[PDB]
């Protein structure tokens, strides 16, 4: 009819916005966790270098 | 006073006062002289019916569009259309209102100069300004970057913009548009027996295209499905009865957009001229253009095009970039809404081409600083 | 920029839906029930006209039959 | 009718799914970010003690 189509369009705009936000948040999590794990690896290498210096 | 935001277009003239949401009067731009003899006396028969009046008497007229591909080929008819638009559809004399026409990119200069000369001499407006049809469609989306594909009815053009700085070397204008799709649909309907020839029946084929055709997500699978089942055959009632059944002509008509080899055009589809337009841009603004691809214009209203185009570009583009296609529901009037917004701005109020300036430099003022 | 999208979108996101629902409800209420009732009324009047026509036709055929 | 109900329910389900997924992703992002900050803070002190050891 008439109002039904507009209501469907609203329900679809919510769909697109929610899905896009979810995808963007997932990409953010991937990037942040990669950052953290690379920092942890750098910390490990520093520990090993400290061990060599102690030797 | 208020400004008149006219938008000539090619196929539908959209006009209205600046500052509203939708154009006040939208009507086809056709001027049709009668072609038969006429025997009733005193019937009050005019010599040319323009606008929406000639879509009701089209049975005995020979409609002819005054704008072929963006450019204007018949200046007298265009003047008649403008006169009708000002006096009968809006009923505001042009002597007291600025006007904001719109023009496709890469159009001949003489067209624009003649347009401004007409507006200043015949209608005698206070001040008029000509704007590129894609920047307005970018205004209406509320963005400031993005690459807009404005597939009108006359010409499809693809203007990329970043941070408000247009890139003049990356505009890809292609002359396939809604009219060629109408002609191709009228040409493939003959494969079932329905022959439309008269210039009046082109309107019927246009209505068929608007109401039935859709863009297939995958072309070969649809061609295979329509050739086995019969779940696609949708029927339609002509203006006199004798319903017709459209089979796989439904998604073959708008497929011409992505494969212009169907109508013999050499160039690549609208899915690949956008990617080429992006790749001509600098290497650092390609991500933003990928993420803010904007659709506009009437012909981009086919059901299922915002998914086919996204699939195609995602196939072409690098796998890391995110491809997003902005397809607002108010696509058809996007250019005019943007025009209203631009005319309503205070910062823009001193960019009009004032009449005294035209009197001092002639019609060639439009190419000058007042663009 | 991009701050008028809220003030031009969120408005009609609810007001338009509610107003169109109101319009549909009022139009259906005004239209469907009244039309069915009026058609039933006209049908009853039509049946009465049919009875009157039958009576008049029969009496005239009775008299005129010679 | 029938189609309106199923389509509306499916679309609302899609919106809710995307929203909850985004919230989970953002929570993990915040936790990973704070842990990364901890890693930075500890790494600076590790570098300082390494420098003293080297001296
Ligand atoms: N709902 C629709 N579905 C498919 N095609 C449409 C629809 N509406 C309009 N069109 C096509 O778009 C054309 C109108 O385009 P428009 O944007 O008015 O052109 P212009 O840029 O000259 O204004 C029509 O000729 C028609 O072929
Ligand atoms: Mg246009």
XYZ file of C-alpha atoms and ligand atoms in Angstrom:
575
model
C 0.000 0.000 0.000
C 1.454 3.370 1.035
C 2.463 3.592 4.703
C 3.630 -0.032 4.733
C 6.345 0.655 2.154
C 7.649 3.643 4.109
C 7.711 1.623 7.332
C 9.651 -1.109 5.542
C 12.112 1.516 4.305
C 12.618 2.734 7.872
C 13.202 -0.842 9.023
C 15.774 -1.180 6.230
C 17.600 2.044 7.121
C 17.942 0.704 10.656
C 19.217 -2.545 9.133
C 21.928 -0.869 7.080
C 23.085 1.404 9.896
C 23.230 -1.380 12.493
C 25.027 -3.772 10.140
C 27.563 -1.125 9.110
C 28.249 -0.228 12.739
C 28.721 -3.896 13.616
C 31.185 -4.429 10.769
C 33.130 -1.280 11.656
C 33.334 -2.299 15.312
C 34.585 -5.750 14.291
C 37.312 -4.171 12.154
C 38.230 -1.929 15.093
C 38.550 -4.960 17.374
C 40.772 -6.742 14.863
C 43.065 -3.722 14.522
C 43.258 -3.040 18.268
C 44.008 -6.659 19.172
C 46.716 -6.838 16.505
C 48.250 -3.694 17.998
C 48.194 -5.190 21.494
C 49.747 -8.503 20.457
C 52.533 -6.803 18.491
C 53.299 -4.684 21.558
C 53.411 -7.850 23.672
C 55.878 -9.414 21.222
C 58.050 -6.290 21.456
C 57.929 -6.634 25.247
C 59.034 -10.275 24.975
C 61.988 -9.366 22.761
C 62.951 -6.677 25.278
C 62.867 -9.271 28.065
C 65.187 -11.528 26.058
C 67.562 -8.642 25.323
C 67.579 -7.799 29.032
C 68.454 -11.444 29.700
C 71.395 -11.287 27.309
C 72.573 -8.052 28.920
C 72.310 -9.707 32.344
C 74.450 -12.603 31.092
C 12.725 37.558 -2.262
C 12.789 33.825 -2.964
C 14.812 32.128 -5.681
C 13.451 29.906 -8.433
C 15.305 26.588 -8.530
C 14.557 25.334 -12.014
C 16.168 22.158 -13.305
C 15.797 21.599 -17.028
C 16.831 17.994 -17.101
C 15.938 15.894 -20.113
C 12.668 14.035 -19.775
C 11.186 15.701 -16.693
C 11.378 19.396 -15.852
C 11.487 19.864 -12.076
C 10.960 23.315 -10.593
C 10.003 24.989 -7.355
C 10.853 27.751 -4.956
C 14.067 27.539 -2.972
C 13.835 26.200 0.555
C 11.274 23.419 0.229
C 11.587 19.645 0.241
C 10.169 18.695 -3.157
C 9.728 20.422 -6.521
C 6.399 22.164 -6.881
C 5.650 21.095 -10.466
C 7.108 18.053 -12.231
C 6.005 17.401 -15.797
C 7.493 15.843 -18.931
C 9.366 18.193 -21.245
C 7.691 17.474 -24.577
C 6.149 19.835 -27.125
C 3.778 18.210 -29.564
C 2.141 19.826 -32.558
C -1.041 18.168 -33.824
C -0.572 16.121 -36.968
C -4.058 15.401 -38.341
C -6.351 17.883 -40.055
C -9.130 18.778 -37.635
C -12.738 19.236 -38.689
C -14.603 20.596 -35.657
C -14.784 24.376 -35.815
C -14.430 26.537 -32.744
C -13.143 23.676 -30.614
C -10.352 25.954 -29.406
C -7.525 23.846 -30.788
C -4.081 25.222 -29.993
C -0.994 24.882 -32.158
C 1.286 23.250 -29.571
C 0.534 21.447 -26.315
C 3.493 21.433 -23.945
C 4.208 19.784 -20.663
C 1.717 17.484 -19.006
C -1.104 18.556 -21.316
C 0.513 16.735 -24.245
C 0.673 13.511 -22.257
C -3.127 13.361 -22.302
C -3.734 14.304 -25.949
C -0.782 12.244 -27.130
C -3.027 10.144 -29.314
C -3.135 12.814 -32.020
C 0.190 14.616 -31.420
C 3.794 14.089 -32.455
C 5.716 14.590 -29.216
C 9.337 15.655 -29.614
C 11.735 16.304 -26.773
C 13.660 19.589 -27.110
C 16.733 18.250 -25.247
C 18.563 15.323 -26.824
C 21.625 14.505 -24.684
C 22.005 17.234 -22.126
C 22.501 19.714 -24.956
C 19.515 21.613 -26.320
C 18.821 21.053 -30.005
C 15.664 23.126 -30.564
C 15.821 26.517 -28.892
C 12.323 27.706 -29.759
C 10.733 24.673 -28.106
C 12.946 25.052 -25.048
C 11.889 28.687 -24.758
C 8.270 27.561 -24.953
C 8.870 25.009 -22.198
C 10.465 27.615 -19.946
C 7.631 30.063 -20.569
C 5.092 27.411 -19.626
C 7.059 26.468 -16.516
C 7.240 30.028 -15.258
C 3.755 31.240 -16.062
C 1.389 28.265 -15.736
C 2.998 25.733 -13.403
C 4.342 28.266 -10.885
C 2.428 31.435 -11.834
C 5.263 33.748 -10.787
C 6.518 36.372 -13.165
C 10.286 35.985 -13.673
C 10.905 39.726 -13.349
C 11.083 39.352 -9.565
C 12.930 36.108 -8.964
C 16.488 34.799 -9.319
C 16.867 31.515 -11.175
C 19.293 28.614 -10.711
C 19.489 26.416 -13.797
C 21.413 23.147 -13.912
C 23.685 21.792 -16.636
C 25.464 18.518 -17.266
C 29.273 18.457 -17.155
C 31.333 18.758 -20.337
C 28.525 20.343 -22.341
C 29.088 22.691 -25.292
C 29.691 26.293 -24.337
C 27.208 27.717 -26.831
C 24.391 25.881 -25.069
C 25.167 27.537 -21.735
C 25.702 30.978 -23.257
C 22.422 30.801 -25.181
C 20.672 29.676 -22.007
C 21.883 32.702 -20.071
C 21.131 35.042 -22.966
C 17.556 33.777 -23.137
C 17.067 34.057 -19.390
C 18.347 37.629 -19.395
C 16.705 38.958 -22.554
C 13.390 37.168 -23.022
C 12.291 36.394 -19.473
C 14.353 39.274 -18.037
C 15.221 37.690 -14.684
C 17.134 39.698 -12.057
C 20.025 37.217 -11.803
C 20.689 33.615 -12.845
C 23.353 31.051 -11.986
C 24.247 27.759 -13.675
C 25.437 24.822 -11.585
C 26.780 21.366 -12.421
C 24.154 18.689 -11.866
C 26.393 16.478 -9.729
C 27.527 18.954 -7.077
C 23.892 19.523 -6.170
C 23.259 15.802 -5.796
C 26.229 15.776 -3.456
C 24.712 18.660 -1.484
C 21.462 16.775 -0.994
C 23.219 13.795 0.589
C 24.663 16.082 3.245
C 28.184 14.904 2.451
C 31.214 16.877 1.407
C 33.199 14.122 -0.332
C 32.236 11.193 -2.489
C 31.926 10.274 -6.150
C 28.418 10.770 -7.505
C 26.997 8.811 -10.443
C 24.090 10.867 -11.777
C 22.437 8.608 -14.335
C 19.709 10.866 -15.661
C 17.524 10.308 -18.690
C 19.724 12.128 -21.165
C 23.311 11.517 -20.095
C 25.133 9.645 -17.333
C 28.062 11.501 -15.764
C 30.301 10.608 -12.849
C 31.887 13.535 -10.987
C 34.293 12.747 -8.115
C 34.651 15.325 -5.355
C 36.883 15.408 -2.294
C 36.649 17.831 0.641
C 34.796 20.249 -1.611
C 37.563 20.312 -4.232
C 36.236 18.905 -7.496
C 38.682 16.955 -9.645
C 38.159 18.246 -13.201
C 40.434 15.652 -14.771
C 38.406 12.688 -13.480
C 34.938 13.412 -14.862
C 33.735 10.508 -17.004
C 30.668 11.453 -19.033
C 28.855 8.656 -20.861
C 25.887 9.216 -23.144
C 23.939 6.052 -22.284
C 20.899 6.900 -20.194
C 17.205 6.233 -19.749
C 16.224 7.181 -23.286
C 18.533 4.617 -24.851
C 17.146 2.024 -22.460
C 13.634 2.912 -23.605
C 14.645 2.511 -27.233
C 16.366 -0.800 -26.549
C 13.350 -2.100 -24.649
C 11.106 -1.033 -27.521
C 13.465 -2.898 -29.838
C 13.544 -6.156 -27.870
C 9.803 -6.212 -27.289
C 9.487 -7.010 -30.979
C 10.775 -10.513 -30.231
C 7.382 -11.466 -28.834
C 5.175 -9.731 -31.384
C 4.461 -6.344 -29.818
C 5.470 -3.538 -32.170
C 5.615 0.033 -30.876
C 6.649 2.565 -33.527
C 4.827 5.864 -33.077
C 6.458 8.558 -30.983
C 3.378 8.381 -28.765
C 3.916 4.680 -28.059
C 7.420 5.420 -26.819
C 5.651 6.762 -23.736
C 3.881 3.430 -23.288
C 7.180 1.590 -23.552
C 8.630 4.000 -21.002
C 5.808 3.153 -18.611
C 6.458 -0.551 -19.121
C 10.134 0.001 -18.342
C 9.387 1.971 -15.196
C 6.836 -0.430 -13.777
C 8.272 -3.839 -14.673
C 12.008 -3.834 -15.397
C 14.566 -4.585 -12.693
C 18.326 -5.100 -12.579
C 19.467 -8.680 -12.098
C 21.991 -9.447 -9.384
C 23.661 -12.055 -11.599
C 22.903 -11.962 -15.299
C 23.664 -15.508 -16.461
C 21.743 -17.178 -13.642
C 18.704 -15.031 -14.384
C 18.952 -15.806 -18.091
C 19.041 -19.508 -17.256
C 16.147 -19.311 -14.788
C 13.864 -17.296 -17.066
C 14.476 -19.852 -19.819
C 13.282 -22.826 -17.733
C 10.610 -21.751 -15.248
C 7.918 -19.121 -15.762
C 8.009 -17.361 -12.395
C 9.230 -14.100 -13.944
C 6.560 -13.464 -16.592
C 4.705 -10.388 -15.391
C 1.757 -9.074 -17.385
C 0.756 -5.482 -18.071
C -2.389 -3.905 -19.501
C -1.985 -1.538 -22.432
C -4.005 1.695 -22.598
C -6.700 -0.218 -24.491
C -6.698 -3.789 -23.169
C -4.790 -6.662 -24.802
C -2.498 -7.425 -21.874
C 1.105 -8.286 -22.717
C 3.508 -10.637 -20.936
C 7.144 -9.644 -20.479
C 9.483 -12.575 -20.018
C 13.244 -12.208 -19.793
C 12.930 -8.756 -21.316
C 12.488 -7.591 -17.735
C 16.143 -7.634 -16.687
C 17.631 -7.456 -20.184
C 16.553 -3.858 -20.756
C 18.395 -2.328 -17.756
C 21.331 -4.698 -18.145
C 22.448 -2.427 -20.979
C 23.798 -0.091 -18.294
C 26.456 -2.608 -17.267
C 27.117 -3.926 -20.801
C 26.797 -1.056 -23.288
C 27.744 -3.482 -26.038
C 24.063 -4.429 -26.254
C 23.132 -1.195 -28.018
C 26.420 -1.225 -29.891
C 28.205 1.300 -27.686
C 31.882 0.531 -27.202
C 32.426 1.930 -23.718
C 32.330 0.066 -20.428
C 29.342 -0.107 -18.141
C 28.453 2.178 -15.279
C 30.078 -0.382 -12.999
C 33.504 0.136 -14.573
C 33.485 3.813 -15.460
C 33.084 4.553 -11.754
C 36.148 2.474 -10.933
C 38.076 4.164 -13.733
C 36.968 7.568 -12.473
C 38.238 6.644 -9.016
C 41.578 5.333 -10.265
C 42.292 8.642 -12.013
C 42.130 10.362 -8.628
C 45.110 10.676 -6.315
C 46.274 7.664 -4.325
C 45.337 9.100 -0.929
C 41.651 9.910 -1.448
C 40.647 6.620 -3.029
C 39.500 5.085 0.260
C 37.092 7.941 0.951
C 35.690 7.806 -2.573
C 35.284 4.034 -2.245
C 33.348 4.447 0.982
C 31.096 7.309 -0.174
C 29.879 6.278 -3.617
C 26.639 8.191 -4.239
C 23.835 7.313 -6.644
C 21.414 9.881 -8.025
C 19.258 10.591 -11.044
C 16.109 8.878 -12.190
C 17.559 5.874 -13.987
C 19.223 4.627 -10.807
C 15.797 3.732 -9.404
C 15.725 0.214 -10.818
C 14.933 -2.330 -8.104
C 18.162 -4.114 -7.258
C 20.798 -1.821 -8.752
C 22.412 -0.753 -5.474
C 23.414 -4.382 -4.930
C 24.582 -5.221 -8.440
C 26.770 -2.128 -8.568
C 28.269 -2.860 -5.157
C 29.014 -6.449 -6.161
C 30.695 -5.311 -9.377
C 32.836 -2.646 -7.726
C 33.808 -5.035 -4.929
C 34.938 -7.438 -7.622
C 37.044 -4.730 -9.268
C 38.364 -2.910 -6.200
C 41.105 -4.148 -3.853
C 39.834 -6.590 -1.255
C 40.691 -4.445 1.770
C 38.725 -1.283 0.961
C 35.118 -1.068 2.072
C 32.656 -0.360 -0.739
C 29.473 1.435 0.267
C 26.792 2.724 -2.100
C 24.572 5.550 -0.862
C 21.102 5.171 -2.417
C 18.683 7.564 -0.717
C 14.972 6.886 -1.282
C 14.553 10.404 -2.694
C 16.889 9.665 -5.583
C 14.831 11.177 -8.393
C 14.654 14.674 -6.913
C 18.100 14.574 -5.322
C 19.508 17.147 -7.735
C 16.640 19.522 -7.127
C 16.773 19.146 -3.344
C 20.468 19.953 -3.508
C 19.673 22.930 -5.698
C 17.206 24.226 -3.135
C 19.761 23.825 -0.356
C 22.421 25.652 -2.361
C 20.078 28.493 -3.255
C 19.044 28.841 0.391
C 22.613 29.426 1.614
C 23.732 32.840 2.810
C 27.340 32.356 1.671
C 26.103 31.735 -1.885
C 24.028 34.908 -2.040
C 26.766 36.928 -3.740
C 27.627 34.420 -6.488
C 24.630 35.197 -8.718
C 25.315 36.717 -12.122
C 23.748 40.139 -11.632
C 22.151 41.718 -14.675
C 24.433 44.753 -14.747
C 27.396 42.376 -14.945
C 25.861 40.688 -17.988
C 25.247 44.076 -19.590
C 28.954 44.896 -19.244
C 30.528 41.653 -20.490
C 27.882 39.980 -22.648
C 26.726 36.373 -22.454
C 30.309 35.145 -22.168
C 30.174 36.151 -18.496
C 29.138 32.627 -17.503
C 32.544 31.124 -18.249
C 34.194 33.846 -16.155
C 34.648 33.945 -12.365
C 30.893 33.720 -11.861
C 30.931 30.134 -13.093
C 27.200 19.815 7.501
C 25.922 16.271 8.140
C 24.118 17.718 11.176
C 20.884 18.484 9.333
C 20.534 14.834 8.310
C 19.217 14.136 11.810
C 16.777 17.067 11.781
C 15.435 16.127 8.333
C 15.490 12.324 8.739
C 14.533 11.465 12.330
C 11.493 13.749 12.074
C 9.784 11.845 9.271
C 11.218 8.553 10.545
C 8.458 8.530 13.176
C 6.025 11.343 12.365
C 5.477 10.182 8.785
C 4.957 6.554 9.791
C 2.497 7.455 12.547
C 0.607 9.926 10.350
C 0.300 7.451 7.477
C -0.902 4.762 9.894
C -3.501 7.237 11.160
C -4.543 8.041 7.594
C -4.891 4.365 6.692
C -6.916 3.631 9.827
C -9.303 6.535 9.300
C -9.672 5.834 5.573
C -10.417 2.139 6.119
C -12.917 2.951 8.867
C -14.643 5.600 6.756
C -14.648 3.536 3.562
C -15.042 -0.212 3.940
C -17.814 -0.618 6.510
C -19.884 2.252 5.131
C -19.541 0.888 1.584
C -20.612 -2.625 2.559
C -23.565 -1.308 4.578
C -24.639 1.019 1.757
C -24.381 -1.786 -0.797
C -26.565 -3.991 1.408
C -29.081 -1.139 1.696
C -29.134 -0.635 -2.074
C -29.532 -4.396 -2.519
C -32.605 -4.391 -0.275
C -34.062 -1.466 -2.217
C -33.289 -3.344 -5.445
C -35.151 -6.415 -4.193
C -38.142 -4.224 -3.321
C -38.025 -2.708 -6.813
C -37.947 -6.249 -8.219
C -41.066 -7.171 -6.236
C -42.877 -4.026 -7.404
C -41.898 -4.733 -11.020
C -43.131 -8.331 -10.755
C -46.474 -7.266 -9.272
C -47.068 -4.552 -11.874
C -45.994 -6.761 -14.783
C -48.271 -9.578 -13.627
C -51.332 -7.372 -13.095
C -50.884 -5.649 -16.460
C -50.418 -9.001 -18.214
C -53.545 -10.285 -16.467
C -55.687 -7.358 -17.621
C -54.215 -6.936 -21.110
C -54.405 -10.636 -22.015
C -57.063 -10.665 -24.761
C -1.795 -10.926 6.153
C 1.378 -13.051 6.170
C 4.297 -11.420 4.343
C 4.406 -8.239 6.422
C 4.809 -10.085 9.711
C 7.657 -12.362 8.626
C 9.587 -9.654 6.784
C 9.269 -7.156 9.641
C 10.312 -9.719 12.246
C 13.294 -10.847 10.171
C 14.468 -7.262 9.640
C 14.143 -6.402 13.327
C 16.098 -9.571 14.088
C 18.817 -8.422 11.678
C 19.020 -5.036 13.398
C 19.232 -6.617 16.853
C 21.891 -9.106 15.725
C 24.054 -6.358 14.260
C 23.649 -4.197 17.367
C 24.635 -6.921 19.836
C 27.579 -7.981 17.673
C 28.787 -4.375 17.565
C 28.487 -4.070 21.350
C 30.503 -7.250 21.910
C 33.173 -6.043 19.488
C 33.423 -2.635 21.175
C 33.682 -4.230 24.621
C 36.551 -6.434 23.442
C 38.125 -3.381 21.788
C 38.045 -1.404 25.041
C 39.491 -4.308 27.033
C 42.265 -4.887 24.488
C 43.024 -1.153 24.459
C 43.415 -1.030 28.240
C 45.591 -4.151 28.231
C 47.709 -2.538 25.507
C 48.106 0.536 27.712
C 49.293 -1.736 30.522
C 51.794 -3.322 28.131
C 53.154 0.110 27.163
C 53.500 1.190 30.786
C 55.350 -1.988 31.765
C 57.551 -1.848 28.655
C 58.788 1.651 29.509
C 59.945 0.485 32.949
C 61.490 -2.618 31.376
C 63.483 -0.305 29.117
C 64.554 1.823 32.085
C 65.822 -1.164 34.076
C 67.555 -2.444 30.932
C 69.307 0.908 30.514
C 70.489 0.842 34.123
C 71.704 -2.733 33.658
C 73.637 -1.713 30.554
C 75.226 1.239 32.358
N 10.709 4.438 -10.867
C 11.504 4.330 -11.956
N 12.025 3.151 -12.329
C 12.807 3.044 -13.404
N 13.147 4.067 -14.203
C 12.688 5.301 -13.944
C 11.826 5.503 -12.782
N 11.516 6.802 -12.752
C 12.130 7.383 -13.810
N 12.832 6.490 -14.513
C 13.604 6.798 -15.725
O 14.315 8.001 -15.480
C 13.945 9.020 -16.400
C 13.740 10.312 -15.633
O 15.028 10.716 -15.205
P 15.260 12.165 -14.580
O 16.093 12.018 -13.342
O 13.932 12.854 -14.546
O 16.130 12.828 -15.741
P 16.643 14.335 -15.614
O 18.032 14.212 -15.046
O 16.571 14.844 -17.025
O 15.648 14.952 -14.669
C 12.693 8.558 -17.099
O 12.834 8.796 -18.497
C 12.632 7.074 -16.842
O 13.080 6.392 -18.009
Mg 19.224 15.085 -13.751
